[PDB]
């Protein structure tokens, strides 16, 4: 018990005379998240309403391909970070590519540069009369910008978190946990700022002045990272010998091709440290495999919550003061970020000292399990509200308006969704941060960035699996999602059964993860 | 890992050349459970339909008082067992009193002895015309029989399980766990036999031949226990010095009135063994306190499941072969016992070796937590089905008949309740047995019977709290249970809102028990 009081000194003194570097890292992450969410908030709507009038399916496919590229680029970004380059140099290069890729969109928004670019001058005005039509216009420039921005965001996401984690490595794991808590807090703050301001300006002022802001944000992030590079000296990895470790991994795999790994490696050139690294990698891979369904259910629930909210009563007299012409569809997603922003400081200042006080959770796997339990509870709560609505809709309906689509909603207030998101928020403040901590703690000291990239890649694989599951349940044979051929007509479909299925999947995943976590802790 | 294989020898060899004693104990428990369930199956109906026509409220109060006496007598039964007597002697005395108390009811069933007894000859025939009416008739004999049978069943319940547990104490805890598994299996088998046969005979043939069978059952149990007493020699406690220990407990409490207990006891005569005993008691009491809500929710869900089943379609062509005149209302409760009988052998033969194989659960507290998680999942599942029914009832209804009351049920098959009970069954085969094992394992070797009595008393307190909660939710101010002024008309009430409340209570209790179990394991 007294050792907990001893470690409380490190916990309180975690932010020693190095706070400037932590602030710079948090600010860079906040600006990067703001730019990313500004880009991803209204990409489909921007593509549809642009003079290059794409189809809705084409815009959805483009956004999905961009997201998949962002998920896929993380392991390669980590490889580039730890091999042939340093961590800070990789961050700088990725941010430069990020800015270069994102600069394309404001030029496309501006009519003069839009006409100058794409060599096509497509002004068919969508519904305006026209002699037939062509395929996706402005394809080269748009695709180049999308691939550049996706690669940049993937690389920064893979590389920034382990760098900031090792920045405070001098202290104990409690310092790393506090840093990850504030890192997630900064991420949510940036997401809130973006989803509010950038979406408001894009939907209600202009795209030309809307897409210019993310470019300024990424420029500020690059500038602050460059300025803080001089004062960082956060024990830079300076990766030049780490390149050898990756090929020693391939040699260890060839040992399989030519504790078996340890018994062959012993007298073999494979030195003990590389043996421990490969054994750790083999141990940690199943943890990611078990976490895949958690990512699936989390992403699917995040997607379905906005759809559920779209068909509830819009509160607050529909913003009577300064009437919201074409109310943006980003604040519904921002509810979760607001709840996380409220929860995180309270957790960090109260719960962590209380848990660490007597004997409670010293490991992240248990926190992930608790978060998954909260996810299952939130899924059950969401299922119930959906069921009542699908029966309370049988009565008269009220024609509301979000954006420029006349939604049909029941006479049920939106605030009834406060519990679900609340549980979700709790789950996140237990799960995600802990997972990040695990992704930093169990990884070998030479290839943390690669492990982070694999973590994000597996999260993306889970998201893709969730989208595929939604497509599967959309089949007429089941009939749960049959009228969902547009922005949303959930009135004619059963989402409560889908919520219950998500809850059951989350429960099974929780049991499997408990088993796997116990096995990992044993070894 | 190899030590698990070493303990597998004890696990397989648990039933050494002492199986006759285990069989005798299991048979005695089975007969006692059969007699108890035969008594409690149709007590209210027997009292109402008897020539001494009581009121429904009076019969319900009598049954509740009997159940409360059974719950309260357990700690005093354990005290009598460990003080001034032995375990076997206490069992024999309690079974003799059990038989003496239960013998009263068949005499009351027989018209000749009924007229001979009670000195009243009350033959008002309930609805038959009569010049006013009196209070509860046959009060002295019925009350004496009820108090005797309650005290006997309380004492046997408090004493038999620790005796059988220490019967196999020669081997390791795995032998005790297997014995408790088969003990619960025998309990469920006896409950099935009673609820089927005795209830069918009572409701469809006669009370005179119905209540005679439990007397034969308890006589057989007493005879087999007496015969096996000679060959038992299961290291009998022969409690005579144990009495001293109990008074030393008060002396420890005298330290309160005159680790404070340990620091005072070291200089005091209180020898270390008594200090360890009192410290263990103080440690274990909070476990029972935390288990109280689990008992509350379990008993309440058990009660509400029969009511939910009563309003579903009766399956199997209403037993077309040998038409069931006045279908008994006990098989609905027997569904859970049937599921437990199916589950227990599979668990014992497959799950326990698999769990014990690599690294899994060595402690009962985690099993109790898993059982409570399954309880919460079953509660959520039950809530959903009830919600659908309360909406599927809005259509036409079908007038079924169970017993002699015309119930109103929806066109939904009873088999849809198979999942709920299944989860419930799993929960039990995780929770109850483990709790029993804990109640035997953590208790001091001198006063195991007292700890078992306290365990059963706290379970009864939880059941009373659950009944009080149901009475509280019955208030018009909430309105969840407003038309439930009879056998049951849940068609007009919201049972789903309750099921969800039970699920939430179980969810909170799970976290509380996890915290308390971790604290107990630390100390
Ligand atoms: C290791 C990974 C395993 C796979 C994990 C992926 C997810 C598994 C769970 C998949 C859930 C599928 C849907 C639920 C299964 C029952 C089928 C079903 O949907 O039944 C419908 C009934 O439809 C059918 O019976 C159609 C059967 C189609 C066959 C394909 C689905 C069966 C399951 C396939 C996947 C296998 C899963 C195995 C169990 C996990 C009920 O809806 P309804 O028609 O009553 O809807 C209400 C209203 O009446 C509107 O119609
Ligand atoms: C450490 C132990 C703590 C206590 C543990 C015991 C159990 C705690 C939980 C008790 C749950 C009580 C019921 C739920 C609380 C909200 C009140 C309620 O029932 O609201 C109803 C609305 O009624 C009211 O607002 C009446 C309020 C009466 C005041 C008493 C109840 C409040 C809670 C008292 C217990 C305190 C619990 C605190 C939180 C745990 C909703 O039903 P309805 O009328 O909409 O029903 C459907 C239809 O319309 C039919 O009417
Ligand atoms: C949600 C739906 C789409 C399914 C999700 C994918 C599952 C099929 C995956 C997710 C987690 C996977 C498990 C993660 C870890 C392992 C440990 C693994 O065993 C090892 O330790 C690997 C090394 C060895 O072979 O000894 C065996 C496969 C298994 C059970 C995996 C089996 C396949 C699982 C269940
Ligand atoms: C571990 C602890 C925190 C308990 C775990 C379970 C709870 C998180 C669950 C159990 C029951 C659930 C509730 C059951 C039903 C509802 C009603 C539901 O709304 C409706 O269906 C109607 C609301 C209305 O219009 O009045 C909103 C979620 C809520 C409050 C749920 C919130 C989450 C609860 C409390
Ligand atoms: C903050 C957390 C922990 C509390 C649990 C969820 C709350 C956010 C809920 C509980 C009570 C709810 C209120 C209870 C009753 C109603 C009436 C309800 O009105 C209707 O159902 C009719 C709608 C109409 O006709 O206008 C509108 C929502 C409101 C204010 C609810 C808003 C959301 C509240 C505050
Ligand atoms: C190679 C082996 C190990 C399988 C692992 C590959 C995954 C990354 C794949 C397997 C199934 C794939 C999914 C299967 C089905 C679909 C539905 C598909 O949706 C549509 O194109 C129709 C709906 C629409 O128009 O939006 C989009 C891709 C997606 C999610 C796929 C995404 C990528 C997934 C998850
Ligand atoms: C963790 C996963 C892999 C397994 C558990 C998934 C469950 C959450 C799913 C699978 C089967 C589903 C059920 C399949 C079919 C139906 C019937 C459907 O319509 C009816 O009630 C009509 C029933 C009838 O046809 O008689 C309502 C949803 C329900 C209960 C579904 C609810 C959600 C269930 C239980
Ligand atoms: C009885 C039959 C019907 C069960 C069939 C399914 C089992 C094989 C599954 C269902 C629930 C599972 C359990 C769910 C949760 C846990 C708790 C978990 O507890 C821990 O060790 C937590 C960590 C710690 O205590 O330090 C270990 C795995 C275990 C027992 C799982 C083992 C596998 C179980 C028993
Ligand atoms: C379901 C509804 C009716 C409520 C159920 C009763 C609760 C009010 C009880 C059940 C479990 C109890 C807890 C069980 C154990 C403890 C440990 C106890 O602390 C000790 O270790 C006692 C010795 C000491 O004082 O140091 C303090 C009270 C507390 C939290 C109890 C507080 C009261 C609780 C929550
Ligand atoms: C940890 C693992 C075991 C998963 C934990 C959660 C499951 C045990 C839950 C999640 C969703 C639940 C299901 C959700 C809805 C229903 C429908 C319900 O019946 C209805 O409402 C309609 C039935 C019909 O007519 O088809 C019966 C329970 C059931 C199958 C539930 C059974 C229990 C399930 C699978
Ligand atoms: C064994 C466990 C693991 C499986 C899950 C629950 C089963 C017991 C369920 C799943 C499918 C169910 C069946 C699916 C469909 C129906 C049709 C259903 O009919 C109606 O809903 C209309 C009633 C009428 O009009 O007569 C009657 C019950 C039944 C046979 C159900 C009985 C209960 C079943 C077998
Ligand atoms: C002394 C302190 C530590 C409290 C602990 C005592 C408990 C054993 C008490 C407290 C509240 C009591 C309950 C309060 C209210 C009721 C409702 C009451 O129901 C009725 O008489 C009305 C309904 C009917 O007629 O059946 C039956 C007794 C009961 C369950 C009580 C049973 C005994 C309880 C649980
Ligand atoms: C863990 C325990 C101690 C606290 C949590 C218990 C919950 C499961 C209970 C407490 C409050 C209950 C809610 C209180 C009131 C309502 C409204 C009731 O009616 C309505 O939907 C309309 C209400 C209105 O008119 O505003 C439906 C059930 C519901 C959501 C209840 C569902 C069950 C809840 C969430
Ligand atoms: C973030 C805020 C809103 C939470 C407010 C409530 C907390 C004080 C509660 C909610 C959930 C509780 C947790 C639910 C379950 C667990 C797991 C339990 O895990 C173990 O210790 C298992 C055994 C082992 O690890 O060896 C420890 C207590 C803990 C963290 C509980 C501690 C207290 C918590 C965090
Ligand atoms: C539609 O036509 C108007 C008037 O010619 C023009 O100003 C506007 O830019 C066009 N819109 C698009 C989206 O090309
Ligand atoms: C009712 O009266 C009949 C005929 O007199 C008698 O046989 C029967 O025992 C009475 N029933 C009861 C319950 O006393």
Residue B174 in contact with residue B364, Cβ under 8 Å?
no
Q: A380 in contact with B at a CB cutoff of 8 Å?
A: yes
- Whether A500 lines ligand 7, by a CB cut-off of 6 Å, is yes
A354 C-beta neighbours (distance < 10 Å), count: 9
Return the residue matching tokens 């007229």: B115
**A327: which DSSP letter?**
-
Residue A106 in contact with residue A215, Cβ under 8 Å?
yes
Residue A158 in contact with residue A81, Cβ under 8 Å?
yes
Helix axes A19-41, A139-167, angle to 10 degrees: 150
Q: Dihedral, CA atoms, B5, B6, B11, B17, nearest 10 degrees?
A: 140
How many angstroms does the Cα of residue A478 sit away from the middle of ligand 4? 27
Q: B394 in contact with A at a CB cutoff of 8 Å?
A: no
Cβ pair A377:B500 closer than 8 A: no
Q: How far apart are CA A131 and CA A148, in angstroms?
A: 34
Q: A360 in contact with B at a CB cutoff of 8 Å?
A: yes
Rounded to 5°, the CA angle B257-B259-B264 comes to 50
Residue A316 zone, left/alpha/beta (φ > 0; ψ -120 to 50; rest): left
B111 C-beta neighbours (distance < 10 Å), count: 11
Query: What six digits make up the tokens of B395?
Result: 């259509």
Q: From the CA of B422, how many Å to the nearest CA of chain A?
A: 15
Q: A383 in contact with B at a CB cutoff of 8 Å?
A: yes
Chain B residues lying within 8 Å of A503, measured CB to CB: 380
Q: Which residues lie below 8 Å from residue B151, measured CB to CB, with a gap of 6+?
A: B69, B73, B77, B94, B97, B101
Cβ pair A360:B518 closer than 8 A: yes
Query: Which residue from B269, B239, B189 is spatially nearest to B445, judged by alpha carbons?
Result: B239
Residue B265 in contact with residue B274, Cβ under 8 Å?
yes
Q: Which residues lie below 8 Å from residue A42, measured CB to CB, with a gap of 6+?
A: A199, A202, A203, A330
Q: How far apart are CA B137 and CA B52, in angstroms?
A: 5
Kindly report the three-state secondary structure assignment for every residue of B110-160. CHHHHHHCCCCCCCCCCCCCCCCCCCCCCHHHHHHHHHHHHHHHHHHHHHH
User: In chain A, how many H helices and how many E strands?
Assistant: 20, 2
Q: How far apart are CA A10 and CA B181, in angstroms?
A: 49
Q: Which helix (H) or strand (E) holds B340?
A: helix B331-346
**Residue B399, strand partner residues:** B408
In angstroms, the Cα distances linking A300 to A68, A479, A505, B517 are 15, 18, 12, 34
Query: What six digits make up the tokens of B191?
Result: 């409950």
Query: Which residue from A155, A156, A35 is spatially nearest to A105, judged by alpha carbons?
Result: A35
Residue A159 in contact with residue A77, Cβ under 8 Å?
yes
Query: Which residue from B426, B363, B373 is spatially nearest to A506, judged by alpha carbons?
Result: B373
What's phi and psi for A284, nearest 5 deg?
-80, -25
Residue B417 in contact with residue B378, Cβ under 8 Å?
no
Q: Output the residue whose Cα is nearest ligand 7's atom 34.
A: A501
Query: What six digits make up the tokens of A430?
Result: 């237990």
Query: Which residue from B488, B325, B331 is spatially nearest to B407, judged by alpha carbons?
Result: B488
Using CB atoms within 10 A of its CB, is residue A20 exposed (0-12), middle (13-18) or buried (19+)? exposed
Distance, CA of B88 to chain centre? 22
Rounded to 5°, the CA angle A381-A384-A386 comes to 110
Residue B443 in contact with residue B435, Cβ under 8 Å?
no
**B492: which DSSP letter?**
G
Q: Which residues lie below 8 Å from residue A263, measured CB to CB, with a gap of 6+?
A: none
Q: How far apart are CA B104 and CA B479, in angstroms?
A: 42
Ligand nearest to the CA of A467: 6
Experimental technique used?
A: cryo-EM
Nearest to A377 among B387, B507, B518 (CB): B507
**A399: which DSSP letter?**
E
Residue B95: helix, strand or coil by DSSP?
helix
Query: What six digits make up the tokens of B200?
Result: 């069918």
Q: Which helix (H) or strand (E) holds B409?
A: strand B408-409
- The superfamily CATH assigns to domain B284-351+362-523 is MFS general substrate transporter like domains (1.20.1250.20)
Ligand nearest to the CA of B480: 2
B70 C-beta neighbours (distance < 10 Å), count: 23
DSSP letters for B152-195: HHHHHHHHHHHHHHHHTTTS-HHHHHHHHHHHHHHHHHHHHHII
Q: From the CA of B380, how many Å to the nearest CA of chain A?
A: 8
Query: Which residue from A241, A166, A220 is spatially nearest to A34, judged by alpha carbons?
Result: A220
Residue A401 zone, left/alpha/beta (φ > 0; ψ -120 to 50; rest): beta
* Contacts by residues B176-179 (CB-CB < 8 Å, ≥ 24 positions apart): B176/B437, B176/B440, B176/B441, B177/B352, B177/B433, B177/B437, B178/B11, B178/B14, B178/B15, B178/B348, B178/B352, B179/B14, B179/B22
- Out of 1.10.3720.10, 3.40.50.720, 1.10.10.60, 1.20.1250.20, which CATH number does the structure's domain A284-523 have? 1.20.1250.20
Residue A194: helix, strand or coil by DSSP?
helix
CA-based R_g, chain B, Å: 24
Q: From the CA of B496, how many Å to the nearest CA of chain A?
A: 10
B454 C-beta neighbours (distance < 10 Å), count: 21
**Residue B409, strand partner residues:** B398
Residue A102 in contact with residue A477, Cβ under 8 Å?
no
Helix axes A207-232, A87-102, angle to 10 degrees: 170
Would you list the domain boundaries of chain B? 18-122+136-240, 242-270, 284-351+362-523
Residue B104 in contact with residue B185, Cβ under 8 Å?
no
Q: Would you report the helix, strand and coil content of chain A in percent, each value rounded to 5?
A: 75, 0, 25
Distance, CA of B431 to chain centre? 13
B206 C-beta neighbours (distance < 10 Å), count: 12
Cβ pair A519:B358 closer than 8 A: yes
Length of chain B: 523
In angstroms, the Cα distances linking A136 to A116, A118, A147 are 17, 11, 16
Helix axes A331-346, A418-441, angle to 10 degrees: 60
Ligand 15: lining residues by beta carbon, under 6 Å: A 51, 123, 125
Q: Which residues lie below 8 Å from residue A240, measured CB to CB, with a gap of 6+?
A: A84
Q: Which residues lie below 8 Å from residue B378, measured CB to CB, with a gap of 6+?
A: B301, B419, B420, B421, B423, B424, B427
Query: What six digits make up the tokens of A244?
Result: 């050898």
Residue B490: helix, strand or coil by DSSP?
helix
Length of chain A: 523
Q: How far apart are CA B352 and CA B224, in angstroms?
A: 31
The CATH T-level fold of domain A18-118+135-236 is Growth Hormone; Chain: A; (1.20.1250)
Query: What six digits make up the tokens of B333?
Result: 């409760």
- The span from the first CA to the last CA of chain B, in angstroms, equals 26
Q: How far apart are CA A196 and CA A201, in angstroms?
A: 9
Q: How far apart are CA A159 and CA B105, in angstroms?
A: 80
Q: How far apart are CA B346 and CA B343, in angstroms?
A: 6
Residue B297 in contact with residue B502, Cβ under 8 Å?
yes
Q: A441 in contact with B at a CB cutoff of 8 Å?
A: no
Residue A462 in contact with residue A296, Cβ under 8 Å?
yes
Pair type for strands A398-399 and A408-409: antiparallel
Mutation test residue for ligand 11: of B415, B420, B422, the one with most atoms within 8 Å of CB: B415
Return the residue matching tokens 């099935």: B192
Query: Which residue from B313, B348, B385, B380 is spatially nearest to B188, judged by alpha carbons?
Result: B348
- The span from the first CA to the last CA of chain A, in angstroms, equals 26
Using CB atoms within 10 A of its CB, is residue B17 exposed (0-12), middle (13-18) or buried (19+)? exposed
- Continuous H helices in A316-447: 331-346, 352-357, 364-392, 418-441
How many angstroms does the Cα of residue A511 sit away from the middle of ligand 8? 7
Q: A518 in contact with B at a CB cutoff of 8 Å?
A: yes
CA diameter of chain A? 81
Cβ pair B507:A359 closer than 8 A: no
Q: Dihedral, CA atoms, A141, A143, A149, A151, nearest 10 degrees?
A: -130
Query: What six digits make up the tokens of A36?
Result: 């990313």
Q: How far apart are CA A400 and CA B226, in angstroms?
A: 80
Query: Which residue from B187, B203, B460, B149 is spatially nearest to B331, judged by alpha carbons?
Result: B203
A200 C-beta neighbours (distance < 10 Å), count: 16
Q: Which residues lie below 8 Å from residue A519, measured CB to CB, with a gap of 6+?
A: B358, B359
Residue A109 exposure: Cα atoms within 13 Å on the Cβ side: 20
Residue A289: helix, strand or coil by DSSP?
helix
What's phi and psi for A408, nearest 5 deg?
-110, 125
Residue A338 in contact with residue A196, Cβ under 8 Å?
no
In angstroms, the Cα distances linking B451 to B163, B457, B460 are 13, 10, 14
What's phi and psi for A339, nearest 5 deg?
-65, -40
Q: How far apart are CA B243 and CA B447, in angstroms?
A: 9
Query: What six digits make up the tokens of A307?
Result: 């759809």
In angstroms, the Cα distances linking B246 to A7, A252, B250, B261, B282 are 44, 66, 7, 16, 14
Residue A307 in contact with residue A523, Cβ under 8 Å?
no
Resolution of this deposited model, Å: 3.3
Q: What is the CATH number of domain B18-122+136-240?
A: 1.20.1250.20
Kindly report the three-state secondary structure assignment for every residue of A95-147. HHHHHHHHCHHHHHHCHHHHHHCCCCCCCCCCCCCCCCCCCCCCHHHHHHHHH
Q: Is the fold of A18-118+135-236 the same as that of A284-523?
A: yes
Residue A503 in contact with residue A302, Cβ under 8 Å?
no
A206 C-beta neighbours (distance < 10 Å), count: 12
B292 C-beta neighbours (distance < 10 Å), count: 19
Q: How far apart are CA A470 and CA A463, in angstroms?
A: 11
Q: How far apart are CA B343 and CA B349, in angstroms?
A: 10
Q: How far apart are CA A492 and CA B491, in angstroms?
A: 27
Q: How far apart are CA B75 and CA B450, in angstroms?
A: 5
Q: What is the atom index within ligand 10 of the atom nearest the CA of A503?
A: 10
Q: B263 in contact with A at a CB cutoff of 8 Å?
A: no
Which residues in B25-109 belong to E strands, given as ranges?
none
């Amino acid at each position: 018990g007294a050792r907990r009081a001893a470690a409380a000194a490190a916990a309180a003194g975690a932010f020693a005379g190095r706070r400037a570097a932590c602030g710079a890292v948090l600010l860079t992450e906040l600006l990067e998240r703001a730019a990313f969410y500004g880009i991803t908030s209204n990409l489909v709507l921007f593509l549809n309403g642009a003079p290059f009038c794409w189809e809705g399916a084409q815009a959805s496919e483009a956004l999905l391909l961009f997201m998949g590229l962002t998920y896929l680029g993380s392991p390669f970004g980590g490889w580039l970070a730890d091999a042939r380059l340093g961590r800070a140099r990789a961050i700088l290069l990725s941010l430069a590519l990020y800015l270069l890729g994102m600069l394309a969109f404001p030029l496309l928004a501006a009519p003069a540069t839009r006409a100058a670019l794409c060599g096509s001058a497509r002004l068919l005005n969508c519904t305006a009369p026209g002699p037939d039509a062509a395929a996706r216009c402005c394809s080269p420039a748009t695709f180049a910008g999308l691939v550049l921005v996706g690669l940049g965001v993937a690389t920064v996401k893979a590389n920034i978190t382990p760098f900031g984690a090792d920045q405070v490595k001098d202290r104990g794991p409690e310092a790393t946990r506090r840093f990850f808590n504030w890192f997630y807090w900064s991420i949510n703050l940036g997401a809130i700022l973006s989803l509010g301001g950038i979406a408001y300006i894009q939907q209600n002022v202009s795209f030309v002045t809307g897409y210019a802001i993310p470019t300024v944000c990424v420029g500020l992030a690059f500038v602050v990272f460059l300025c803080g590079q001089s004062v960082f000296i956060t024990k830079p990895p300076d990766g030049s010998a780490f390149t050898d470790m990756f090929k020693i991994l391939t040699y260890s795999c060839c040992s399989q091709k030519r504790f078996d790994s340890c018994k062959m490696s012993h007298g073999g050139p494979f030195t003990e440290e590389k043996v421990e690294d490969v054994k750790a990698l083999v141990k940690i891979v199943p943890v990611f495999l078990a976490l895949i369904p958690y990512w699936t259910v989390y992403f699917q629930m995040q997607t379905t919550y906005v759809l559920q909210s779209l068909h509830l009563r819009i509160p607050e007299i529909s913003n009577i003061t300064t009437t919201p012409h074409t109310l943006p569809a980003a604040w519904l997603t921002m509810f979760d970020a607001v709840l996380i922003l409220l929860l995180i400081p309270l957790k960090d200042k109260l719960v962590d000292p209380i848990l660490r006080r007597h004997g409670l959770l010293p490991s992240s796997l248990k926190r992930i399990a608790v978060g998954m339990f909260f996810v299952m509870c939130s899924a059950f709560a969401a299922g119930i509200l959906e069921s009542k609505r699908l029966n309370l809709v049988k009565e008269k309906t009220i024609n509301q308006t979000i954006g420029n689509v006349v939604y049909h909603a029941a006479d049920l207030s939106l605030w009834w969704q406060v519990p679900q998101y609340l549980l979700i928020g709790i789950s996140e403040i237990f799960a995600s941060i802990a997972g990040l901590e695990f992704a930093y703690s169990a990884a070998p000291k030479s290839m943390q960035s690669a492990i982070m990239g694999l973590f994000f890649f597996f999260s993306g694989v889970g998201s893709f699996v969730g989208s595929g599951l939604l497509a599967l349940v959309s089949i007429k044979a089941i009939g749960w999602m049959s009228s969902h051929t547009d922005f949303g007509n959930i009135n004619g479909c059963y989402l409560n059964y889908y919520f219950f299925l998500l809850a059951a999947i989350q429960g099974a995943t929780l049991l499997l993860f408990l088993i796997i976590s116990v096995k990992y802790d044993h070894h």
